[PDB]
Design a binder for this molecule. Structure first.
Ligand SMILES: COC(=O)c1ccc(C[NH3+])cc1
Lengths: 151, 151
């Protein structure tokens, strides 16, 4: 139980660090108490073991799986290329793309934690409860993943 | 059960056709009666639902999951980037590459069905029981997969 949360955070940090250094857009939504069943159906069901290697391969550009969101439920990568609700927020910075707006929209209707990697800048962002934390350091990302994903 | 096997066939056909037209080298071994857990242990575990989209994403070059073979066990992509033993056969044409020799090798020690996509020519090959069916057409690959995977 404790080890599953450790691997999940490590898999997220390693994968996003890889993609951030290569300007690879990413969109990983980790479900919590709410339940994102209807949003898992919108993509390709994987029900896969969580690994940093698989997360990297999913968001590779011009691939069948990169256009959408990875949804992590339980101890599995539930699906890839899934579609999340888009937030109509006017406060989200105009220079942020569809990935950030979809990450913001899912945080407004679920208690899930969502991670974003900008394909334009390589910055990492987080969304929770209708708010976005932009361009986080590895230390900031680690603290928030601990606070939100560890029970 | 019957739809799992036919979906497995479709996933292989669509993924290999996608990669053949782009000269993306691929190596897919489908286990049958002989266990391949020894070679699954050599790759990265996925335990993922079978789909053509995931097969395509795995074999994208210069990615963590691509360097090796995909092993399919039961109704799952068991592992990616797995090792397959190289046949010592001198009968295998020198025009072919390591993927073909690796497919031939596992076909000699298992009853598994293995699919190869040449990254040089795009041709689709097939190994079974020590035999090589080289550069098969789509109609050929379709009939072979039906006879050998639908039980
Ligand atoms: C629960 O997870 C942890 O405590 C944890 C600690 C360190 C790393 C490595 N950066 C990942 C995870």
């Amino acid at each position: 139980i404790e080890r599953e949360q450790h691997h999940l955070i490590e898999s997220i940090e390693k994968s996003t660090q890889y993609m951030a250094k290569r300007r690879i857009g990413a969109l990983i939504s980790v479900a919590r108490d709410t339940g994102m069943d209807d949003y898992i159906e919108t993509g390709i069901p994987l029900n896969a073991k969580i690994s940093s290697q698989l997360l990297i391969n999913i968001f590779i550009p011009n691939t069948p799986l990169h256009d959408g969101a990875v949804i992590i439920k339980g101890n599995e990568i539930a699906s890839a290329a899934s579609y999340l609700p888009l937030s109509d927020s006017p406060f989200l910075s105009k220079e942020l793309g569809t990935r950030h707006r979809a990450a913001l929209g899912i945080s407004e209707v679920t208690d899930s934690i969502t991670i974003v990697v900008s394909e334009e800048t390589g910055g990492i962002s987080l969304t929770k409860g209708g708010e976005l934390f932009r361009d986080v350091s590895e230390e900031e990302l680690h603290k928030i993943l601990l606070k939100e994903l560890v029970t």
